Amino acid sequence: ISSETGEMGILWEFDPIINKWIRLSMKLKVERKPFAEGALREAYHTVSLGVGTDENYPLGTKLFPPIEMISPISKNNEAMTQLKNGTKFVLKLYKKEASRELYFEDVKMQMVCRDWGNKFNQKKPPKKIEFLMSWVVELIDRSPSSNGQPILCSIEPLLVGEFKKNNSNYGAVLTNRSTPQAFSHFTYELSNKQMIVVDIQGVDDLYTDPQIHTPDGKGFGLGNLGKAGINKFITTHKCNAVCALLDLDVK
Ligand SMILES: Nc1ncnc2c1ncn2[C@@H]1O[C@H](COP(=O)(O)O)[C@@H](O)[C@H]1O
Ligand SMILES: [Zn+2]
Predict the structure, then answer these.
(1) What CATH number is given for 161-251 in this structure?
(2) Separation of 221 CA from ligand 2 center, angstroms?
(3) In the record, which residues are listed under signal peptide?
(4) Which numbered ligand comes closest to the C-alpha of 249?
(5) Which segments within the chain are labelled E, that is strand?
(6) Which CATH superfamily does the domain covering 1-160 fall into?
């Protein structure tokens, strides 16, 4: 949309309720230096210069995600309000030394957790939670890295405030707060033990970068540690007033 200097990107949004990816474009201006780093990625402040369609950037014939997983229509999406021209947000790049599939899997995983957030909030707990949207962006104006595969990154809204990690994906309980731990326990019980959401982290109860474990270990990226991840959560978990309010089993 905007005529100002920045760079273009193909923007991908996953929508769980129709089970499709929605493909868009946007222009963005990203700062030169990151403002934070974790173990694997760096985060950069970025501003949006508008969201558009992908009609100038045809797909052609090896596509991931596959064509049947892509919505033919993209007129409605969260990006058009949440990343509208002017918005400050965050872009995350992996450090030098992540396949194409994993960017998409991590964004899908976050959208799945966001759904679990809504389901938890429907039980009217004392504190509601929310997982941020997340999106894949192909930075198409940048030079390809080792191959004709473009530069990929993920983007999400800016969290304002003190960022805290509340548990990890392997059993750590890092704060005293109840709601995070009760949420993890909720996802375990109400999924009939088919999955658990951990790596609950963010600002207050606005969360981002969660991790799912499933018993069979498949999908949900490299952080999916299977039954081991699940058992490690169980070992350290102490039920709290929120667990009890949600009528969860003290097993
Ligand atoms: N959405 C966000 N808004 C603001 N800060 C963030 C956000 N996500 C992550 N951070 C911070 O940036 C660091 C690097 O991101 P991560 O790759 O998720 O570890 C985190 O450890 C946080 O301190
Ligand atoms: Zn509990």
Answers:
(1) 3.20.200.10
(2) 25
(3) none
(4) 2
(5) 7-15, 20-30, 36-37, 41-52, 88-94, 130-131, 135-138, 152-157, 164-165, 196-198, 201-203, 206-207, 211-213
(6) Phosphorylase Kinase; domain 1 (3.30.200.20)
